[PDB]
Amino acid sequence: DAELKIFVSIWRKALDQYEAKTPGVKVVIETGGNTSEMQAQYLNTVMSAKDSSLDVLMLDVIRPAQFATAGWTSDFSGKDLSAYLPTYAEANTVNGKIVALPAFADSMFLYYRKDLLDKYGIKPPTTWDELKEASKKVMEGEKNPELQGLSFQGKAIEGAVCTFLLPYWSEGKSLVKLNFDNKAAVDSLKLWKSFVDDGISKKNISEVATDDTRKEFQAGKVLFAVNWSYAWTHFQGKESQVNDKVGVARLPAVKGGEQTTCLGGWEFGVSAYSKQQDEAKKLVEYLSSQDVSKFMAINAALLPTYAALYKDADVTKTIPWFADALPVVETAKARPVTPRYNEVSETIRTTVNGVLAGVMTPEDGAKQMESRLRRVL
Numbered sequence: 181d182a183e184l185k186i187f188v189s190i191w192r193k194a195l196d197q198y199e200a201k202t203p204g205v206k207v208v209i210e211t212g213g214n215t216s217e218m219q220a221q222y223l224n225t226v227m228s229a230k231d232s233s234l235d236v237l238m239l240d241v242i243r244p245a246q247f248a249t250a251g252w253t254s255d256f257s258g259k260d261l262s263a264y265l266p267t268y269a270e271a272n273t274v275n276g277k278i279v280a281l282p283a284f285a286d287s288m289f290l291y292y293r294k295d296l297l298d299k300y301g302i303k304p305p306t307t308w309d310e311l312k313e314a315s316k317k318v319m320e321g322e323k324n325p326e327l328q329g330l331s332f333q334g335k336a337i338e339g340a341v342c343t344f345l346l347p348y349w350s351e352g353k354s355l356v357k358l359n360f361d362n363k364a365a366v367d368s369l370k371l372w373k374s375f376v377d378d379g380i381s382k383k384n385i386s387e388v389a390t391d392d393t394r395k396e397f398q399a400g401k402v403l404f405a406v407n408w409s410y411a412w413t414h415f416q417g418k419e420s421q422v423n424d425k426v427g428v429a430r431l432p433a434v435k436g437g438e439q440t441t442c443l444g445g446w447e448f449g450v451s452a453y454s455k456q457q458d459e460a461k462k463l464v465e466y467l468s469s470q471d472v473s474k475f476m477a478i479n480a481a482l483l484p485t486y487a488a489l490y491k492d493a494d495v496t497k498t499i500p501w502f503a504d505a506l507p508v509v510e511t512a513k514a515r516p517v518t519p520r521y522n523e524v525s526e527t528i529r530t531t532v533n534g535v536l537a538g539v540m541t542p543e544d545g546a547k548q549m550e551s552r553l554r555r556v557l
């Protein structure tokens with residue numbers, strides 16, 4: 181018997197299946213913020229205070245180092261992660277302890293209006309330069325002041341960390357020992373600024389969060405969108421203007437660079453302060469199972485944590501492009517692994533937001549970012 185509390189901020193469907201096979205166990209969803217940094221700030225407060233209310237925590241792929249070192253989670257003792265994609269086995273392992281079980285993979289893709297590219301004879305762009313030239317050509321034809329060339333995240337949210345690193349990684353650089361490439365940091369901030377200055381992105385991109393990009397593209401207002409796999413279900417759902425009008429490509433590269441992307445995804449941890457440790461673990465073993473991974477791929481376009489589900493016939497029937505997504509996820513670059521990740525994120529996202537709001541130049545942004553990261557890495 182148990183009333184379990186899960187922090188998830190279609191999962192209700194998965195929880196109803198567990199309840200239907202587990203008599204005397206009911207599960208209630210709890211929330212605290214939309215974007216991941218908001219969820220982190222909240223969980224820091226209640227975990228710091230040893231709050232026993234939550235049993236299971238849905239945590240971002242960037243969280244296990246913090247949660248492990250603070251002793252905020254109950255480790256899966258003797259657990260083998262070898263069935264999961266190795267990138268997620270590694271992320272959920274800290275000094276040899278299994279901190280959490282993978283919930284779903286994720287990576288950033290380029291969503292595009294394949295109807296608009298097709299009308300203008302344009303191929304999916306492989307460089308930001310090709311994306312600019314495509315946007316200009318489509319915008320000149322459409323004469324549509326509501327049509328944005330490129331939606332990307334400029335709000336001071338976790339997503340803007342990812343935004344900063346896409347061009348940095350593309351140029352072949354790494355952040356981590358801190359290894360700050362100033363030229364590539366300014367080049368990243370200049371690129372995102374250049375879309376606002378050129379009109380290819382809207383004047384207030386600094387106000388745009390992950391799900392703003394999702395809603396605006398879904399409403400038919402965006403040619404090109406940087407986003408995560410979950411967007412797909414919404415694009416092809418009942419309140420979309422873009423059903424059957426969406427292509428998915430690897431992100432453009434910077435001139436002469438690689439088509440790199442950011443690793444994302446989430447995992448289920450058990451709270452160290454949970455009073456229902458045994459039933460919490462059993463719920464997490466169900467939620468991290470292959471059957472539930474498959475259900476979440478088909479019903480919510482969450483990329484699987486199991487390699488085999490990428491080319492499972494029921495998964496590809498629903499989302500054909502998942503068959504091409506496995507190597508993108510497998511090769512995706514990771515945000516720095518550190519217990520102090522919240523300080524890394526805070527520095528990077530506020531610098532991106534400031535540059536895009538015009539509050540600081542890319543040059544001053546990069547300098548201030550490097551000074552702040554030095555005290556943290």
Ligand SMILES: CCCCCCCCO[C@H]1O[C@H](CS(=O)(=O)O)[C@@H](O)[C@H](O)[C@H]1O
Nearest residue numbers: 215216286337338339390408410444445
């Ligand atoms: C039914 C459940 C749907 C939720 C699936 C996507 C959640 C957002 O997660 C993605 O974006 C984060 C940035 S942000 O949007 O929080 O700024 C990244 O950190 C994550 O790694 C990535 O998976």
